[PDB]
């Protein structure tokens, strides 16, 4: 053997000489360790760049969020499909999780790859259909997951943007569309099985799933192969693009666009700049150009060239293989710079290109493609070094202890690379214990660990929906609801049918809106909504003078006897009449009541029932202008002239009436609801006379206590009602006024909590608190100008323990209620201005719309979806609404006025 290793020393003496010689020539490629920090430092600020907003939009580093936020713990069971595409083959495999993956590789050509999006994934279909036929699973309804290699735009993980194309695909039209429906066009143009992509994931990320499976400490997934890249596990506080606070979540760094801006215009060469001039996406991913396995080769094949040319190789000898594209490959650079091999095969794959080489040329071609192989190694180093610094800082400790999952062919199969890149990754990171784990069995056993997972959520995501399916009324049901209430108008205005009919129509004595010569000075009382109030108004014909003072009433008198709420009334009046210095003159009183009122003239007015919070007794029955006499005698103080008893809407509608002549319609959405109208005296059959007007004061918030809505009261509507005071009563009112829409998002939460689906299917004291939700928080929660954050926070100052996704579906809870509130209360309004269009008989309306109430007045979209409902389903009409800011009080003083005058 003494000839071996007399040869061996040959070629040591041949080489170094050389060696010097090619260092000097390709010094370009030879990338200090400083550089390296250099660039590790570079990448840094790349990356933060990537993750920022501010800078996001011009971050070559894209540092796309992924929807993974943890590796596997093994919770995960059942059997998947797994399709990966875009590394050197397209394989499908069926996972089922201990793991047991069975996959097959299809061949596909250099038609579908640089094809149709459509031809490419009818080829992914068939396949797909292939191998569930194969396989014998097209029956079993199995989740499949999607390992697509490519830069996607993912907002949920069912969704998956195609940004460009890398590598070797480029087929028309899927870049900027979503690959997972374009997979669906596929499988239902062939229509011969059926299948549901529920996870779309980067190969990065398939990788990094598949190693923490088996090792807990992988937070990073890396890939050197057809192309390069690398994912990591990310804190959520840092990735701006993605709102939440809590735990981290996978970002696919997509580093091979490092670069592109032009970042590393300083280190790329002329021969990578050839490469890119002659590439199927010139100018894009350049870090990669220079690091991948499908770019080294060809990257030899052009220095080669250039010393041949320039006779530092083969005698200057050129051939035609040398100069066609591909002749030299990265198969080739692997073989060359084999330990013992290595010599022999530069010889053996030179010759083959016809060029004679000597024995110096193929020392030399090897150097070179150590060069080449080493530049590779090193760039990856430095980058990955960033991405575990960026680790290391996030864990606050100056010391790293963590796994990087590796894949790709050109580490697994390079004789020199994956040393040369962890020696000198090691060095850059010196304060950092790394491991790296080969997926050895590829991306997709932690594809289904990321589809089982996707699954499961997606699941949990239908029973809700098959929940809140129930609060969104179809336009042909609203338009029902609408003719629904017509009907009811007619039986509470007609003679015969209106001791039965549940939309009483009651006829509140005002028979027209301000005739401007009103005058005086009045009390007036404002009972029924949140804030009782005692007024003082001035009216001058014309000028209003306005005064009031809220005086609370406890819970205990409100439901206590009608003789404790009327004596606080009373004392309340005296109060007022001191403050205001009027204590003495008996004065005109108008009581604004807000509840159903029998009346037979203005001054009476026997309380028909209690609604909403009032429920003290003995006052049903009786006329609570009645009661009120008895209260000022009882207490022997002051006297005053009970003029009129008045309801909120009709009070609403007239403070507006006066100031707008067109207002005849007054609508009240607090509290509680309802609406009263100008309703042609030919029609009000329970009050006789044949001329003019009445305001008819419709209890709409009764509509359906027959049974007339029963067909979209839901489970939780029952609910509420049944947990009521008056249960079986107001029920279009309690799915509409803010001391009920509160009650209904409380109970879908508990129902969404028990399940799981929320809080930690945790039921909470404050869960279980009656009224939590009030009128000032949904409004908030459903607001725009919130951000997640404030939402989150309004719902922990309720005592809630929300999270940021807890805090989402929250949300969402609370807009199906409300909107479904300001969709039937439009429905309402609706019926309301047709019957006003037909009983004046005219083809097109215009009346304006007198409104109060908190809940419309503190929320962000009732109103609006209102209004648009209103118009939709009356187009014969343009209602108007106003809203009336000085309160029933004026209305009910302007009442009082022309109710003295008789
Ligand atoms: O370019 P490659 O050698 O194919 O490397 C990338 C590919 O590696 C395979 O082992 C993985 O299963 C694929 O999910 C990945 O896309
Ligand atoms: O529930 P609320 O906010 O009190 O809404 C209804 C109430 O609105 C006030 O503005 C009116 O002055 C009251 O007469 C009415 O009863
Ligand atoms: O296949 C490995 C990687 O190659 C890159 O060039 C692609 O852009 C990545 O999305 C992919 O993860
Ligand atoms: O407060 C607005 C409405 O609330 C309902 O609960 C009452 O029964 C109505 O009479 C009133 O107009």
Redesign the pocket.
């Given at each position: 053997m003494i000839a071996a290793q007399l040869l061996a020393y040959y070629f040591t003496e041949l080489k170094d000489d050389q060696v010097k010689k090619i260092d000097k020539y390709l010094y370009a490629m030879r990338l200090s360790d400083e550089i390296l920090i250099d660039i590790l430092t570079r990448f840094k600020k790349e990356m933060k760049n990537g993750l920022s907003r501010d800078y996001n939009p011009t971050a070559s580093v894209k540092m796309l969020p992924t929807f993974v936020r943890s590796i596997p713990d093994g919770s995960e069971k059942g059997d998947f499909i797994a399709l990966?595409l875009?590394?050197?083959?397209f394989?499908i495999l069926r996972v089922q999780v201990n793991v047991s993956m069975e996959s097959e590789i299809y061949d596909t050509p250099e038609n579908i790859v640089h094809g149709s999006g459509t031809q490419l994934f009818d080829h992914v279909a068939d396949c797909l259909g292939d191998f569930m036929e194969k396989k014998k699973i097209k029956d079993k309804k199995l989740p499949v997951g999607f390992?697509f290699?490519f830069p996607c735009r993912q907002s949920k993980i069912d969704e998956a943007v195609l940004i460009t194309w890398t590598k070797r695909f480029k087929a028309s039209g899927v870049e900027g569309a979503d690959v997972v429906k374009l997979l669906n066009k596929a499988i239902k143009k062939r229509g011969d099985y059926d299948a549901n992509i529920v996870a779309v994931v980067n190969?990065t990320v398939?990788?990094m799933m598949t190693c923490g499976y088996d090792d807990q400490q992988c937070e990073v997934g890396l890939?050197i192969?057809?192309?390069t890249n690398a994912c990591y596990m990310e804190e959520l506080r840092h990735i701006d693009l993605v709102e939440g606070d809590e735990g981290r979540m996978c970002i696919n760094t997509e580093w091979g666009a490092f670069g592109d801006d032009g970042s590393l215009e300083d280190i790329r060469t002329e021969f990578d700049r050839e490469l890119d001039r002659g590439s199927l996406n010139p100018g894009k991913q350049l870090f990669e150009k220079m690091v991948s396995?499908?770019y080294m080769g060809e990257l030899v094949r052009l220095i080669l060239v250039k010393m041949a040319k320039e006779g530092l190789l083969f005698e200057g000898r050129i051939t035609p293989e040398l100069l066609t594209r591909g002749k030299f490959n990265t198969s080739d650079v692997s073989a060359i710079e084999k330990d013992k091999e290595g010599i022999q095969n530069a010889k053996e794959i030179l010759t083959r290109l016809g060029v004679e080489p000597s024995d110096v040329d193929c020392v030399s071609v090897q150097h070179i493609c150590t060069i080449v192989s080493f530049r590779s190694a090193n760039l990856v180093a430095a980058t990955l070094g960033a991405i575990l610094n960026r680790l290391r800082d996030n864990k606050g400790t100056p010391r790293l202890r963590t796994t990087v999952g590796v894949?790709?062919?050109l580490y697994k199969m390079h004789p020199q690379y994956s040393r040369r890149f962890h020696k000198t990754l090691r060095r850059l990171v010196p304060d950092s214990d790394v491991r790296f784990l080969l997926?050895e069995s590829?991306?997709?056993k932690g594809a289904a660990m990321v589809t089982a997972v996707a699954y499961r959520l997606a699941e949990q995501h239908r029973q809700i929906e098959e929940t809140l399916a129930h609060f969104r009324l179809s336009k042909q049901t609203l338009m029902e609801v609408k003719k629904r209430l017509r009907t009811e108008m007619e039986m509470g205005l007609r003679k015969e049918t209106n001791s039965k009919a549940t939309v009483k129509m009651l006829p509140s004595f005002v028979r027209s809106i301000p005739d401007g010569t009103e005058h005086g000075d009045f009390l007036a009382l404002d009972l029924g909504g949140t804030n009782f109030r005692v007024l003082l108004v001035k009216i001058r014909s014309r000028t209003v003078e306005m005064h009031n003072k809220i005086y609370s009433i406890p819970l205990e008198i409100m439901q206590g006897t009608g003789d404790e709420l009327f004596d606080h009334i009373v004392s309340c009046i005296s109060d007022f009449l001191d403050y205001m210095g009027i204590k003495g003159p008996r004065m005109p009183l108008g009581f604004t009541f807000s509840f159903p009122c029998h009346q037979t003239n203005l001054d009476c007015g026997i309380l028909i029932s209690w609604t909403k919070g009032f429920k003290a007794t003995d006052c049903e029955g009786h006329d609570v202008a009645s009661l009120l006499r008895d209260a000022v005698k009882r207490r022997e103080e002051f006297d005053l002239d009970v003029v009129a008893v008045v309801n909120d809407t009709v009070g609403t509608m007239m403070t507006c009436a006066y100031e707008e002549p067109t207002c005849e319609i007054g609508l009240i959405v607090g509290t509680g609801t309802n609406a009263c109208y100008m309703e042609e005296m030919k029609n009000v059959e329970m009050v006789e006379g044949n001329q003019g007007q009445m305001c008819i004061n419709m209890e709409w918030g009764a509509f359906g206590d027959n049974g007339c809505l029963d067909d979209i009261r839901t489970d939780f509507d029952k609910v509420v009602d049944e947990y009521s005071l008056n249960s079986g009563k107001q029920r279009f009112e309690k799915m509409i006024s803010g001391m009920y829409l509160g009650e209904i998002v409380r109970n879908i939460l508990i129902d969404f909590t028990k399940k799981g689906f929320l809080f930690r299917g945790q039921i909470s004291e404050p869960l279980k608190t009656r009224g939590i939700f009030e009128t000032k928080f949904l409004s908030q929660i459903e607001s725009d100008r919130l951000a997640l954050l404030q939402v989150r926070a309004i719902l922990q100052q309720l005592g809630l323990n929300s999270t940021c996704d807890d805090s989402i579906l929250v949300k969402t809870v609370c807009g199906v209620v409300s909107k479904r509130a300001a969709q039937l209360c439009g429905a309402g309004m609706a019926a309301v201005v047709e019957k006003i269009r037909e009983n004046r008989g005219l083809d097109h309306l215009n009346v304006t719309v007198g409104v109060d109430g908190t809940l419309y007045k503190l929320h962000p979209h009732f109103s609006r979806i209102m209004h648009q409902t209103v118009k939709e389903l009356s187009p014969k009409c343009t209602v108007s609404f106003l809203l009336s800011e000085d309160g029933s009080g004026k209305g009910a003083a302007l009442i009082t006025a022309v109710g003295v005058r008789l």
């Open positions: 990966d875009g590394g050197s083959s394989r390992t290699s190969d398939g990788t890939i192969g057809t192309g396995g499908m894949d790709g062919s997926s590829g991306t997709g």
